[PDB]
Design an enzyme around this catalytic site. Sequence first.
Site, short mmCIF file in Angstrom:
data_model
loop_
_atom_site.label_atom_id
_atom_site.label_comp_id
_atom_site.label_asym_id
_atom_site.label_seq_id
_atom_site.Cartn_x
_atom_site.Cartn_y
_atom_site.Cartn_z
N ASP A 248 17.90 -15.51 25.03
CA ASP A 248 18.93 -16.31 25.81
C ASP A 248 19.23 -17.87 25.39
OD1 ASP A 248 19.07 -14.52 28.01
OD2 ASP A 248 17.71 -15.55 29.21
N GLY B 15 0.76 -1.19 0.15
CA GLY B 15 -0.05 0.07 0.00
C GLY B 15 0.76 1.26 0.14
N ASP C 241 18.80 -5.03 7.52
CA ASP C 241 18.80 -3.99 6.09
C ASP C 241 19.04 -2.83 6.31
OD1 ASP C 241 17.81 -4.29 3.22
OD2 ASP C 241 15.90 -3.55 3.76
#
Length: 266
Positions: free
Chosen positions: A144, A10, A117
């Site tokens: 962990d 969109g 990224d």
Amino acid sequence: VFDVLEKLGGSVYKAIHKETGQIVAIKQVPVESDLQEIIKEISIMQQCDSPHVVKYYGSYFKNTDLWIVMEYCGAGSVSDIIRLRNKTLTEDEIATILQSTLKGLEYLHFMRKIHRDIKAGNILLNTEGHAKLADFGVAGQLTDTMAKRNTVIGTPFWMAPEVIQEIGYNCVADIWSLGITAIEMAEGKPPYADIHPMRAIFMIPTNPPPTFRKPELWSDNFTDFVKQCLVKSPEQRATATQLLQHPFVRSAKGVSILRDLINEAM
């Protein structure tokens, strides 16, 4: 509640919060689409509280669309700014932008998140000139019982060797991506940009660390900064904290030096 103005992308909109007058960005996405990365992005931003990370404000349904409300960054990405002006960045402009970017990384890494990224298209500037990391849709979370990630993911030219190889990796994968981003901002495109991305990805692990196309244009500070980011061995590679003390970064000018840049672009 929100008075939507123009389309910025969109799709993305500029809007006013009618209750404060504060400007926001609203991303519109149809509910009947693949929301996998929207979901991951928002889950990561919700956990963050940093002036160097884009903030998430909330979500609404509207007529079969999902509206995601986020921090507004008026100048757009560094990559947009470069295209708009048709100019690459100077050493000073890059040192300022990357100083804030590194504070973003230091925060994320302490929070056990790998952005995955990092590139000029995902560093946004607000109109006061403060940089913020955006687009967390492929971010990874260490825990962990999971001290390394091993998913081969990111954008090809900017991916670290260890992310491409089968072995697991940690937060310093982002530091490699930042060195590639420094080159991209100075030269206009990353190393390997004119070759097929599916071909480049196989070269990254085997090739020596990339250098500047034209080494003679750049200071020893900037040249050394890129060398440290692009250390092939992940275990030896500098952290975000350590790089904030690098001479190229620690002497960075205030954001006032980007006023030319923003004004011209906008």
